[PDB]
A paper describes a structure:
To understand the structural basis and how DNA is stabilized in these complexes, we determined the structures of PspF1-275-RNAP-σ54-DNA containing mismatches between −11 and −8 [RPi(−11/−8)] and between −10 and −1 [RPi(−10/−1)]. Interestingly, DNA with a partially opened bubble between −11 and −8 did not support transcription, suggesting that this complex is unable to proceed further to an open complex. In the RPi(−11/−8), we observe multiple structural conformations, at varying degrees of tilt of PspF1-275 hexamer ring relative to RNAP-σ54 and varying degrees of RNAP clamp opening We also observe significant degrees of promoter DNA bending, demonstrating the wide degree of conformational flexibility in the complex. The DNA density downstream of −10 was generally poorly resolved, indicating that this region was highly flexible. However, one conformation has sufficiently high resolution to allow us to resolve the DNA. In these complexes, we observe a previously unreported interaction between PspF and σ54 RpoN domain. This interaction is only possible with the tilted ring conformation, suggesting this interaction contributes to the stabilization of this ring conformation in both RPi(−11/−8) and RPi(−10/−1), giving rise to the higher-resolution reconstruction of these conformations. Significantly, we observe the σ54 N terminus is further shifted along the PspF hexamer in RPi(−11/−8) and RPi(−10/−1) compared to that of RPi(−12/−11). This would thus support the mechanistic model in which we proposed that ATP hydrolysis and the conformational changes within the hexamer lead to translocation of the σ54 N terminus; and RPi(−11/−8) and RPi(−10/−1) are further along the transcription initiation pathway. Second, PspF1-275 hexamer ring tilts, as observed in RPi(−11/−8) and RPi(−10/−1) structures, altering interactions between PspF1-275 and DNA, which could contribute to or stabilize DNA melting.
Residue numbers in the entry:
A (entry chain M): 1 to 10, 13 to 48
B (entry chain 4): 1 to 259
C (entry chain 5): 2 to 258
D (entry chain 3), E (entry chain 2): 5 to 259
F (entry chain 1): 6 to 82, 88 to 258
G (entry chain M): 288 to 382
Write the structure that this text describes.
Amino acid sequence: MKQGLQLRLSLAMTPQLQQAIRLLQLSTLELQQELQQALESNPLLE
Amino acid sequence: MAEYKDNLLGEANSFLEVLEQVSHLAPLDKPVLIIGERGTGKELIASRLHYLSSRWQGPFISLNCAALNENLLDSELFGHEAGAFTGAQKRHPGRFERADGGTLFLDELATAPMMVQEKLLRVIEYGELERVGGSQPLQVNVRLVCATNADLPAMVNEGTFRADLLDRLAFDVVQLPPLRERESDIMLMAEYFAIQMCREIKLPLFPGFTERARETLLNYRWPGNIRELKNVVERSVYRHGTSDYPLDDIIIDPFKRRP
Amino acid sequence: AEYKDNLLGEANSFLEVLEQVSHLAPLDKPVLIIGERGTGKELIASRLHYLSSRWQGPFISLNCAALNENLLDSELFGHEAGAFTGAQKRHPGRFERADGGTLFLDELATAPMMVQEKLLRVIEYGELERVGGSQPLQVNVRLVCATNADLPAMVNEGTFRADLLDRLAFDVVQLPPLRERESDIMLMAEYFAIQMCREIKLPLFPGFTERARETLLNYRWPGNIRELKNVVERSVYRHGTSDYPLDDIIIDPFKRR
Amino acid sequence: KDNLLGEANSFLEVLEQVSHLAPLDKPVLIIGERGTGKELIASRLHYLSSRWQGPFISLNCAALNENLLDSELFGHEAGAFTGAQKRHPGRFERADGGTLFLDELATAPMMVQEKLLRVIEYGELERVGGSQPLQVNVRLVCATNADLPAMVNEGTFRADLLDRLAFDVVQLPPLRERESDIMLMAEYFAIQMCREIKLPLFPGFTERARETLLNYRWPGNIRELKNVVERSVYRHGTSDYPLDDIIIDPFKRRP
Amino acid sequence: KDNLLGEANSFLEVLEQVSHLAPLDKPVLIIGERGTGKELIASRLHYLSSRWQGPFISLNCAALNENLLDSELFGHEAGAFTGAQKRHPGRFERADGGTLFLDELATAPMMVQEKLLRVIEYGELERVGGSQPLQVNVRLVCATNADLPAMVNEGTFRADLLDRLAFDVVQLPPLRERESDIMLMAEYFAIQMCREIKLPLFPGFTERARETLLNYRWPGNIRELKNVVERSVYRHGTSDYPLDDIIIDPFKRRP
Amino acid sequence: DNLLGEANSFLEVLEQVSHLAPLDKPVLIIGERGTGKELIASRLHYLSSRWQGPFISLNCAALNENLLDSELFGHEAAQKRHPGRFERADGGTLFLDELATAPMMVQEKLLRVIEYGELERVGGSQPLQVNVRLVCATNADLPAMVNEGTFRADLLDRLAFDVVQLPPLRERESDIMLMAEYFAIQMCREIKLPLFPGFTERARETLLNYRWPGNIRELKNVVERSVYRHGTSDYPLDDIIIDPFKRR
Amino acid sequence: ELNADSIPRLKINQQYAAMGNSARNDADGQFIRSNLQEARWLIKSLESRNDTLLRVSRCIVEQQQAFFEQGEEYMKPMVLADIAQAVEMHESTIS
Ligand SMILES: Nc1ncnc2c1ncn2[C@@H]1O[C@H](COP(=O)(O)OP(=O)(O)O)[C@@H](O)[C@H]1O
Ligand SMILES: Nc1ncnc2c1ncn2[C@@H]1O[C@H](COP(=O)(O)OP(=O)(O)O)[C@@H](O)[C@H]1O
Ligand SMILES: Nc1ncnc2c1ncn2[C@@H]1O[C@H](COP(=O)(O)OP(=O)(O)O)[C@@H](O)[C@H]1O
Ligand SMILES: Nc1ncnc2c1ncn2[C@@H]1O[C@H](COP(=O)(O)OP(=O)(O)O)[C@@H](O)[C@H]1O
Ligand SMILES: Nc1ncnc2c1ncn2[C@@H]1O[C@H](COP(=O)(O)OP(=O)(O)O)[C@@H](O)[C@H]1O
Ligand SMILES: [Mg+2]
Ligand SMILES: [Mg+2]
Ligand SMILES: [Mg+2]
Ligand SMILES: [Mg+2]
Ligand SMILES: [Mg+2]
């Protein structure tokens, strides 16, 4: 509408973490294998 | 190199010579300006010019002239490189930028903003333009197509149209034969429109036109060159019955008072 | 689908209008409805769209007059992708509604001259109103118009272009005046009274007094349906428990005491 | 250098004045003369100047938008809007010492004139909320097709805008006034058009008709008058056709 | 330190009044014709003021539009505001303790005047998301060419605010009104240009040039003198041949 | 606490203002380019139980409507809990200035704040009702201007129970000479002047032939201009600085 | 509703978190903090993926109720963009 600039207040590049999260939800039974694989590496998750 | 004659109708008058002149001027890529009949026929002239232009020459970019009050029009004409100009913050190409090597079918809307015409003067100055917030200018090439519906010299004298706007444009003027002046293919164009309307309505047979209808059409002013006549034919077909006694009953237009 | 003509006008003029609408329903062209304030024009257009061969997909009766700005109406006709920022609604949806459908507008005289020119340019080509950085889409859409103001009056005013007025006006539907219609008015009033007695779930229908009916007929009632429904509601609020035929008209909120 | 010249005594005097003013980076307001002042001449003058070695660049004054004029002076500002976050310099700052040729000067807004003349006369490159403005001495020159004193009498242009000019307003003679190389210029334009019209040469020509066509109003521009030759050549479309009995009146309807 | 082009008895009185003006940051207003250059004299006085080494603000007011004080004047150091995440400086805030000269404050928005009313009345008004602002120690200065006496009568500015904006307003006499030392200024400009144009020496002005300068209207006053100097640079001719007369007119035809 | 010229009508008005000061009712004030009751408003806040209470005085002209509700306790999407307009003024004096030229959106917000409305912003769903004593001033617009449709009628109804009338400086100027002398002494201390050389009684009477459009502001400006013109304290001044915007 | 048995669930090791918080070795504490951050990101991602799948399924059912009830014959012609429109996610998230 009327031309202007920012006069009041109101995105993201998902990295490898959120990128693999998006790469997740591909399957469920297969997702369990990857989750077990991650839980093996992560020592603070049960 | 294709015909694409389309619905090129009403050439029995000197419009055949106008089409010959248009064909002669078609190879040139210089500025193209016309004077369409007020109310009808400018779109047909533009389509004929586009057919005259090579099909592979480029896209036929058509814009209806508008004032500069809408900043969107300014972004379309000059471009939009910086943010908050048009589209995304990136270099969203404008309408002029959208046309690269194609026809720029201008409209003689006689828009109130002379500033818009002044900006368009730079659009065709050396074949270059700069987007809104454009860090570097861009030299572009495109064909130009224009038309008219009023007396350009009258506006030039009255100051309604910029003198430089007329000077830069209008390499040659193409005049459309008026409906009150053409008057030649009225029977032929009327028959073509009637056939098309009958096909659309799935009419079993051609109803035919009485001689009184032809006399009335001759007496008719016909403000629109090829659209008002077609609209009148459609209205008559709506109020008539094909190959039946209702064929005599012809309706000029619903705007006219009912019989 | 099938046209709905509930409480159709008993006047033969309404029947002739319906016959013309049925004749034009197989056809696909714009229509102009010469209506009045609350005359019932838009409902007639909706009924025609129901009778307009198939159901004709989406049917939208958006009015440019009842819009905050002409720019909003233009955005409804077509929204350029990425133009400005944010919106009250998905503007391209209004354009998509006409796709596989028709175009219906109310009080078209209020449309801006630039908006009217954009619409005239769209209608001849059929393409989308806003390019949005891409070639506009030619959706197969019909059209319909309904303005109380006279088209020749607009032409004299010059707000609408000659081509706009000509190509826009393909069919004319002159709504009979509500005050002029009497038998149709009585039939519609009886139908509305029955429908209200059913919907309000009143155990017994009060009916209508002869004096009350005469007074209702004496009223100008420009709103053939809108004012009729308002008066029906005014009488219903003064619920007489099927025993009071006074039918007091409290439709005017300003009127009191 | 590359641009063709009028090759006239008045044209020679104008070229000499341009050469004298070439080393000067001061503002110029050479009269646009309503289409008769070849912008290519100004480009060649900038080429002669050291601004050719610098970043010489021009722009149209009236091209900018009303709400972005401050941006137009200073480019894209980093804090102007949420999306763009970069202190992009202005077009003048994109030149920053080059030759800035101002076109559409008479069409600039009153507020635009008040901002631009004030900034140019004195002031440094200050963006939206900048820390410290940066002074960039950029060579300037302007064009005005109309009479600036007429605007001053009308008051449309500011007196500061009148003083913004630092060099003498070079004015080109009108096509009716100059009319000196009309034969040679017409021959050059005809050769260029024949090359453009894929015509090797014109077997028919008439110098008397060319002189008669020179004896015309030639309104709009001298280049506009030359375009009449191209229009006539295109209409004829033939080589063995003398220039005699040939008049280019595209606006006029033929009988 | 402070180079001065004006050496006159009225100029001497004005300079003494400048000496009579101390760094009180009072709402004094320097009034002069177009090209008066009184802003330079005000900057020189600010250098001579208590803040011998202090900040100075040019602050071309015409560049401000649709922007509050916290946009460029006060600044937006607060984050998460309108736009991206950053902290912006403020010209008025950064100028605290220095000089805040208003460039052509006559051409200002009505809302700008409304804000400046409180800004000058209190001195601690604006804040980008702040509760209590801090009073600025800057020195308020201003200079333009319009006559506020009629603008206030016309309602262009708030009479109460303008009166509060006026404390020791001083009007500089025009150079045309002065009509003295024009020859000395011309000689100084000739020397400066000969240095600039690398000329051997000033050609010299005869009695005809002196009479023309005396008879010159000089509506621009000091601006007219600068324009005449630029023209004489253009009209330098030969150093050996003294310039009998030197004239300039933007619309004067060459013949 | 507050220093001003004293007049009998002004003394009675000040006494009434002090009496109303302990009351926390909303205040709507009209000024005449003099003290403008801003000093009177501060003295009222000091005399009230809100002496230690907040005395936020917002000059409502420089804000942007896009954040107007943000100013009046509005926060949205990183840092939150920003002090609102009423929140920062809660528990004490809440003064509004520059009300003559405020936007109509500000008028609607004030109408909402008349019943104290509520501030359900993303930063906080506060019910407002801070109960702090409201006060309004800078009513440059005449009552006819309000009747001219400039402001909402409800806001005028929502205004204070009474109106603070201000008389012109021309109406009462008996102590104007004393105030001018005090201002001259203050400026001499500020200008590091040795001492006041005095004033000419004939020149004082000549200067008295004025309407004082700026009232105390005009008196102070005239005194400052005359002192600057004198530039010395050898002999008493015998001239009047009629106007800085006067040709000479 | 999502199948409760089928949905995987992760729990943060409270003993490990307590040990890392009170870890005497600074390097061990930093490693524990990094592992906790990674695990929290993974858990949040898994929960968000499950919730998004549930919402997408609900939206799909809203429009496919006709095929669900009447049968395969009353299947509405639907596209990926059709489902994407009813939700705030993109067609890529739909895929
Ligand atoms: N031979 C023809 N072929 C196709 N269309 C024609 C022909 N003759 C007339 N027309 C019609 O005449 C109309 C001219 O309209 P147009 O010139 O665009 O109106 P305006 O001049 O008012 O802008 C077109 O819509 C076109 O359908
Ligand atoms: N023939 C009819 N039978 C039953 N109801 C009708 C008829 N014509 C109009 N109405 C009623 O009149 C009401 C208003 O119609 P209309 O005036 O066309 O709408 P709008 O206010 O959009 O113009 C509708 O709700 C409709 O139910
Ligand atoms: N000597 C020349 N030779 C060829 N073309 C010229 C010559 N002088 C001007 N032109 C043409 O004139 C056009 C520019 O017009 P110009 O005189 O610059 O208008 P304005 O005076 O408004 O700037 C250019 O496109 C250029 O081709
Ligand atoms: N004291 C002075 N001595 C010599 N030249 C001066 C003096 N003051 C101003 N000028 C001339 O005035 C011009 C700039 O004036 P300007 O700053 O536009 O006046 P204003 O203060 O009215 O804006 C300079 O080119 C300069 O040559
Ligand atoms: N009784 C007084 N004692 C001391 N100073 C006063 C008195 N009355 C007015 N003034 C001075 O007059 C000035 C008027 O300022 P302000 O209240 O902003 O005026 P306005 O009400 O027009 O906005 C103040 O700065 C103040 O110093
Ligand atoms: Mg309606
Ligand atoms: Mg048209
Ligand atoms: Mg030009
Ligand atoms: Mg100046
Ligand atoms: Mg005040």
